[PDB]
RNA sequence: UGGGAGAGAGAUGAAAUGUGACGACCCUGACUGGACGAACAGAAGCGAAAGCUGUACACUUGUAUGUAUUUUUUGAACAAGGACGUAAGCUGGAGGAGCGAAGAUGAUUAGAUACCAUUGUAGUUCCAGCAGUAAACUAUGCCGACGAUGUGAUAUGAUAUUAAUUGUAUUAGAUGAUAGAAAUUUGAGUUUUUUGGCUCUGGGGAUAGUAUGAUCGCAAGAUUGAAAAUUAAAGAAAUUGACGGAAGA
């Protein structure tokens, strides 16, 4: 049978795409096909927030902040929880952003 | 951090050194500096064997911080063998540890989760240069042992000191 | 006012899961006050990238700093870089808070990641790397 | 100390100490100290401060707490006594402010040229913008043409020639640090599309002057 | 390759060979080569299909929307014939950074010539030609008439004017309705109350895409393609249990 209803990806009207590689393993996907995801974490520790203030030569100042975006093969995802398997009647659920 | 066992002393009248495996020591842990307060006897006949991630002679798990030590025995490479005769007339094989040049091995040891520290006395087997043998020896206070032949034949140990050295 | 027994220098810190390795230079980069690395002071092979090792290695750089007159540091952190995934260590954070509690004050923070335009062929097959 | 020693088969005192110099367009041109070792007596150490490469804060020469992201890095020609002297050769955005301004579901548009000073020397710039929201709110879909994509670039084109055709260091520097650039690029690209974040990313210098 | 400095760097679940005082690894100043266009980047666009992302010019080319422009039936699909066709693989010359079949070493194992790790050649890059196979899949040939509401997307015209609702061509999704053995479903609907036109393919499993003949190709090989002797099953969709060296509460 069918298991869903586009079959592995959202790709419609083309022909192919270049593939690219995952972090982990490192084998080769396509970038329809794959799982992304998206996390900003900061320099310093919220552990380490008030030490910094008493070392400061400075008056104020702001901490910086920088992003990241990985990318996984499906198998090296599930293996680390990042997706797990659904409902059946609960695969339907789209959680956009 | 492979070990070895080292005796080094003053030697005369002697051909080998022959001991059973099996020493007490002192261990300690390499996560976190934690000295194990009581000693632990190892032996060559205890194993433990698991098929695909590890095999060894003993275990422990620390307290302070819970890391794994395994420990294992390896026998001696410089081995050799001397045929000797008894009080009736007859031929006995016997299995000894050649003494070099004021030093002597008598086995190797290996560690992948701590440190060896001491090792205790261990009443080792005494080998006669002019062919005898004899069976278990003390090392007494003075780290010093002497004993006399009936025919007027001497043999001595003079300052027994046990060491450990990283290879 | 700037004397011989006062000054501003940079700190370099690579931090990756198997080793941390801390370099303090001046302002130019091309001399080295000092450089010592985590797995100098730890015996076993599995704790060389350690968070344990780390603080041992961050107190004995503090103590020889002091003797060549450095007030105040700036900050270097970079990861692997390139082709390797580049993300910051375990012994990132427990560095920058040792070299600060010993009383040295801290100038600038920056973040120099070397990331490439594009990639070259990664290690591993069609199929990956299958542990 | 993982190795053992038998496995395997103080100059710091006679050092010299300088002084740095920026040049003078900004209030505070002391940077730092250096150092140099000297060899023996009748030795010149000056052919080995000429080729290093310091780096400073816009914010520690202004003086101000306003602005840091802007970077600065001078190249060292001449000695005089204790002092060596900087000029102006590079500059370069931080990191973390480039990652900021980059966003999904909206358009981004660069640009570069090549441009000469005065003297004989070459210089590069290199120009970002991104969109900006429509009060016509009913679209996630705020991306733009391809074929406006052209006509804002040949407005990056002009505005890059005229506010750097000739003029002098003085003036190039001074012009950078008040970001006279990407405000008036804003006005006159927002006339075909509404943009926002324009800013300067990078300067690299192609030749050496004489 | 020029400066500084003087013990380990690198990998794994955990290690070993290999590697460094003829000085690595790290921070610096300059150079030469080969490959590739990160983040923006989508159930978004173009193409007969295979396919197509750095900038500026030159040459060249689609579909759709408007409209008192020329001609007058020139149409759909196709035995014979013709062109294009990812990835490997072949002959000739250029080039070779990273990756790497075959070959050789270190661990695991009863045994590993396999998974792990270190090396290492052809190849993958460019030009000129042969070759014609893929789960080449939307597993749904091409043309033509009619069809229920709701939220979107690309292009463009009218009304209208800063506030909207409307025309044509494609396309994504949800709820009903039909049809179906069922999963599912704007066609896979308008069917036992079976007909608008035209090409190709199948007839219980296995022997078998195997022999033999013919036509192609430098070769590897490609297209066409049986039988003797055998056997009561092979198979598709879906319910109830049992099991998992499967996951959560
Ligand atoms: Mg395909
Ligand atoms: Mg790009
Ligand atoms: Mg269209
Ligand atoms: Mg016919
Ligand atoms: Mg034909
Ligand atoms: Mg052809
Ligand atoms: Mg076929
Ligand atoms: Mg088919
Ligand atoms: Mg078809
Ligand atoms: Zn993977
Ligand atoms: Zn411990």
Same mark, same amino acid.
């Not at chain 2, 395994?70 to 410089?78: D, G």
């Given at each position: ?21 995952? %972090? ?7 970038? %329809? ?23 400061? @030569?400075?008056? $104020? ?34 959680? %956009?952003? | ?12 009248? @002697? ?153 | ?45 599995? /704790? ?55 009383? $040295? ?27 | ?94 990191? /973390? ?17 090549? @441009? ?23 679209? !996630? ?18 505005? @890059? ?46 030749? !050496?002057?004489?």
């Amino acid at each position: 049978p069918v298991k869903r209803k586009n079959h592995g990806k959202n790709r419609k009207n083309r022909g192919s795409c270049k593939p690219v590689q995952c %972090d982990k393993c490192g084998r080769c996907v396509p970038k %329809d096909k794959a799982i992304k995801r998206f996390k900003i974490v900061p320099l310093v520790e919220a552990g380490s927030m008030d030490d910094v203030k008493v070392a400061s @030569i400075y008056d $104020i100042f702001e901490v910086p902040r920088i992003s990241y975006k990985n990318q996984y093969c499906i198998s090296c995802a599930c293996h680390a929880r990042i997706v797990r398997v659904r409902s059946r009647q609960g695969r339907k659920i789209r959680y %956009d952003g | 951090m492979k070990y070895e066992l080292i005796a080094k002393a003053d030697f005369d009248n @002697i051909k080998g050194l022959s001991c059973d495996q099996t020493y007490p020591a002192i261990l300690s842990c390499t996560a976190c500096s934690f000295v194990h307060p009581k000693v632990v006897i190892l032996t060559s006949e205890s194993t433990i064997k698991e098929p695909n991630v590890y095999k060894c002679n003993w275990e422990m798990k620390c307290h302070s911080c819970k890391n794994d030590i395994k420990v294992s025995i390896y026998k001696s490479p410089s081995l050799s063998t001397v045929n000797i005769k008894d009080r009736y007339e007859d031929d006995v094989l016997v299995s000894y540890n050649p003494v070099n040049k004021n030093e002597c091995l008598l086995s190797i040891l290996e560690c992948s989760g701590g440190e060896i520290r001491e090792i205790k006395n261990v009443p080792l087997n005494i080998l006669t240069d002019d062919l005898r043998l004899f069976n278990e020896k003390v090392v007494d206070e003075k780290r010093s042992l002497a004993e006399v032949y009936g025919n007027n034949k001497t043999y001595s140990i003079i300052n027994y000191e046990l060491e450990i050295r990283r290879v | 006012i700037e004397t011989s027994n006062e000054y501003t220098a940079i700190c370099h810190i690579k931090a990756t899961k198997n080793n941390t390795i801390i370099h303090v230079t001046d302002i130019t980069g091309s001399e080295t006050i000092c450089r010592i690395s985590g797995g100098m002071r730890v015996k076993s092979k599995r /704790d060389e990238g350690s968070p344990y090792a780390a603080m041992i290695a961050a107190q004995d750089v503090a103590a020889i700093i002091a003797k060549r007159g450095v007030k105040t540091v700036h900050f270097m952190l970079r990861g692997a870089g390139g082709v390797k995934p580049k993300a910051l260590g375990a012994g990132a954070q427990v560095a920058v808070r040792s070299i600060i509690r010993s009383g $040295i004050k801290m100038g600038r923070i920056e973040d120099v990641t070397p990331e490439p335009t594009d990639k070259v062929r990664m290690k591993g097959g069609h199929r990956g790397r299958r542990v | 100390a993982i190795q053992p020693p038998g496995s395997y088969a103080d100059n710091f005192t006679k050092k010299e100490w300088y002084n740095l110099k920026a040049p003078s367009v900004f209030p505070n041109n002391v940077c730092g100290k250096t150092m140099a070792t000297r060899t023996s007596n009748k030795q010149d150490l000056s052919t080995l401060l000429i080729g290093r490469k310091f780096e400073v804060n816009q914010a520690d020469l202004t003086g101000n707490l306003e602005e840091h992201a802007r970077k600065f890095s001078f190249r060292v020609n001449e000695v005089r006594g204790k002092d060596c002297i900087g000029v102006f050769d590079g500059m370069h955005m931080t990191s /973390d402010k480039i990652k900021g301004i980059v966003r999904k579901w909206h358009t981004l548009i660069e640009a570069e040229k090549d @441009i000469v000073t005065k003297d004989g020397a070459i210089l590069r710039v290199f120009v970002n913008a991104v969109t900006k929201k429509t009060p016509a709110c009913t679209s !996630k879909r705020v991306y733009c043409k391809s074929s406006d994509e052209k006509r804002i670039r040949k407005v990056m084109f002009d505005i @890059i020639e005229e506010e750097l055709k000739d003029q002098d260091i003085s003036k190039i520097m001074k012009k950078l640090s008040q970001e006279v650039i990407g405000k008036n690029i804003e006005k006159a690209g927002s006339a075909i599309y509404p943009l926002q974040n324009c800013c300067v990313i990078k300067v690299k210098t192609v030749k !050496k002057a004489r």
